[model samples]
Structures are given as C-alpha cells and as structure tokens.
Target: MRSLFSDHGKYVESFRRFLNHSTEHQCMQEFMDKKLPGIIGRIGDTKSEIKILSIGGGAGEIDLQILSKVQAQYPGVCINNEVVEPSAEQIAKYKELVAKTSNLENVKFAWHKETSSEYQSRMLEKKELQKWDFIHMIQMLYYVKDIPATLKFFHSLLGTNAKMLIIVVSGSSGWDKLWKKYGSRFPQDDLCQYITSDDLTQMLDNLGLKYECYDLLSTMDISDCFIDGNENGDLLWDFLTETCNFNATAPPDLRAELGKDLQEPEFSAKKEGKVLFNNTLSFIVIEA
Candidate 1:
C-alpha cells in the first residue's frame, strides 16, 4: 500500500500543491486579523525580548503572519523566532521567504530542521531549556507519535503569561466524517490523527488545563475531485485522506463511496454553481 510521507519527494510536492489550493492561508489571515489580536493583548507588556517557537511552521507563511500580529501589538520589540521544521527543502523556502520579506528587521531566526520530538531531545541534551513567549503548532500535530505528550511538553515551555496556539481541523467538518469512515482501512502508522478542537478541549479539560477555543469558517473547492485523471483532484484527494495516490490506491468500492459522500450536502455543497467542501478549521489558545 502506498502511504503518504513514505515517498518523501512525492509527499512534499503533493502537499505543496494541496496548500496552494487550500483555504488554509485565507483562514490564517482571518485568524491573525481578528482572533490573534486578543491573544497578543493577553501577553501583557514584556520588558525583555520575546521568544517564539513554531513547530512544523512549513515554509514560513503562517509563521510570518503570526509575527506580523506580534509586531503590530508590540512595536519595535525585538523577537527571537525559533522555527522547527523537519524538511531541509522547507527550511530553504523559509529562508527565501525571510529574504523576500523586509518587515522582519526586528526579528531574528534560529532554524532547526528537526521534528518536534527531536528538538525536545536536543533541548534536553543542551540542558538550557528556553521558555517561549509565544509558541504555535499549525496543522502539524498529526505527524507526531504522541499528541498528548507533545502537547504537554510544549505547554510546559511557556513563559509567564505566554500563549500557545494550535490549529486543527474541526470535528464538525467533513474531514472528521471521512476519516472516521475510512481510517481503519489504511495502515496504522500513527502519523496522522484526525482530531478536532472539541477533542483537544476535552483532553485539556481532563488535564485540568484552561484554554480558549475558536471555530474558523473555511471552505475548499472540491468540484475537480470527482473527475478522473485530474491532477488537482488527485493532489486534493491525497491531502483530504492523508494518503498517497488516494484515487489510484483506494479500493474501488471505497473510492466510489467517497465520491458520493464527498458530494453530499453534509460534506460539500453547491454554492454559486460550484461545489465547495466544508474545510472549516478551529484553533485553541492556551495562556500560561
């Protein structure tokens, strides 16, 4: 069975294309414009430099957006931006992004091309754990082996009155429904977890942690998905299912079922004569 991320090059390209078509960037912009301001306000006045950690930041798009909000909130404040991404190519792209963006003059970057767990191990080895004023995990938790452990580790790294933000797909979205229906058929690598804001809130509550959650309205165009041999459709399907060559490798019955279900009003709808999927996302903000 072909699995996503097993073939690193193909996985990267497919994911890149998926990001280009996703409403993720749009949603993040809205988040920064509206929800992020309040979160930044809660950090209070900081006399010293601010430190930020972005796990799985991915090419620095959302990371820059977050920085923009922080800069707006605390003008002229020096910031140390630590980016932990596992891919070298992504790191290169991130560097390119930094070069292209001029407003990052007040920001300095420390890049780590390592996974979250690997970074944690390195920090432990160095024995100089640095607390972060703002830490964010954006759409990357699914790749980790232990979600709870990872969350706890990052949460423990927050400075006083600091904020940790996490973004994931919402339980109410079609992704949850599709994953719930077809997840068992795929090989269990534990690399991807179909979680939502409600699930995270429940876990946080169980741990006696206080956090605020928000639902972000977003949509994706899925009209091309039903077409055979469509490049865009194939990439979107891979992203949707977190599988490689999903349309080709999926069982015939399962593929047909997905097509039918994805077209349903519960999963997608015809809006302005275009089929749009419920790609709604959610975010959680935890203040320490």
Candidate 2:
C-alpha cells in the first residue's frame, strides 16, 4: 500500500479535513490556555532573549499561539524562533500567516525546510551548539525513524530551565486500538509509524527521565467515514489508515474489516447520530 505521505498535497487536504471534524485543535488550545502559562512562567527570566525551536510546526498556527504566550509572559524580550518543517507548501502558508499577522515584531523567524533528522544533521554539520529555551514537537514524533535518538538529540539541546513539549495521540485512544489491530496490514515506513504517548513514556522511563504528562480528551466526527462514496469519508479513511486512497486501493476484505472495526465500541461511540472516534491527545513536558 502506498503511504499517504507520498502525495503531500493529498495528505495535507486529508489532514485539514480531519482537523475540521475533530476536536483536537480545540483541546490543544484549552491545554495551552490552562497549562502553557505555568510552563512558560517557570523558565528563568534572566535571559536577554528567548530562543525557541519548533519542529514540524506545520502552517505555524500553533507556533504563533505558543509564541504569543511566551511574549505575554516575557514582555519586550526578543524571540528567536527556528521552524523546522519538510513541506514547502506548509512553509509557504506559515510565511504568509506571519506576514499577515501583527504584533510579532519581537519575534524573528528562521525557516528550515528539513525533517527533524535532517535538521539535526545540518545543525551538527554547522557546529550549531545553540540551545533553545523552549522546543516543541507536536504530533510529529511518529514520523521519526528512531524515537529514542530523536528524543536524546533534542533533550541535549535544551538550555537550563528549559522545557521540551511533545504531543501525540494517547495510548488509550481509538488510534492506538486501531493501529494495534490493523497496523501490520499496511506497509510501514519511516514516515508513518503508529506511535502513541504510551510508547514514548515507556522509552522515557527506560531512559530514566522524569517528565509530566497530561491528557486532552477529544473526539472526531467519523460518521462520514461509514457512508459509501463520500469524498470526505474517503479522505478521512485515507488519513486514518495512513494510506493513499485507502478506500479505493485496499483489498476489499481488509477494507470491509477495517470499516466495521472502526465503529466498534473500542474505537468510537455513537452519540446524537454521529460516530465520535476517540481522538484523545497526550502532552508530555520534559524539563532540563
């Protein structure tokens, strides 16, 4: 099966549709509103400027929100933000967003058109030992080939009194259950690993690192997915399976099995005539 990432445009379109139907972003915003201030508040205030690294900050919407919190917390402080994202389309959108936004004068933007691993390699090649006060890798760790190595590299770059925030699907979410059962059926790739916070926290525990974890309960309206010949449904199916054109390309039996399984009690709940899949997210904050 072809990976959804093989076609970046389709992937983005599917993801946007997913976001529209899911409460993921709203939950994230609530998390940020409730917790980010406290997290940012703890950072040492002695620095003349704050440095941040945003890995896989697609389209920069969340990045800008986080930066706003930082700016509010440390008014008048210069901010150097480095954005690492592989998609040129997303980068262009991010740039356009920044250009249209106001009151970001204190924040300076630097763009890197590379994946986390490639960005790390380039940084090493350039001998860039610059540390960041706050680094975030939201919904992006699943793409990394080596989770431990990636965590180690980023953790090593955290300055004193700094924090690295990671967000991913919760281990107990429908995604976990779905992948646990059907992940092997799809072709696996470095770009599309079915990772959850459970796997990540276990690795952190093995590495003997202490961190804080929070859960954000969310749901996606997946009722469209069960309907036949629905465009959004097909896109959602592709996004869910991480396969390009999953509805059309998957084996008939496999597709039928997955379609039925997706509506099971373990995967989603029926409410108000809508099938709401558990799209919960976990936020892990590591301090240095």
TM-score of each: 0.93, 0.95
* Cand. 2 Cα-lDDT: 0.90
For each candidate in the order shown, give its overall lDDT on alpha carbons: 0.83, 0.90
Q: Candidate 1 — which pairs collide?
A: none
- Judge candidate 2 at residue 273 and give its lDDT: 86
Could you tell me which 10 consecutive residues in candidate 2 have the lowest summed lDDT? 186-195
Among all candidates shown, the one with the greatest TM-score? 2
RMSD per candidate (Å) reads 1.8, 1.5
Q: 153-261, model 1: which lDDT tens digit per residue?
A: 8988998889999999898887777778877776456566667777788888877667888888788888778778998888888867767888888888888887888
Clashes (backbone N, CA, C under 3 Å), per candidate, total: 0, 0
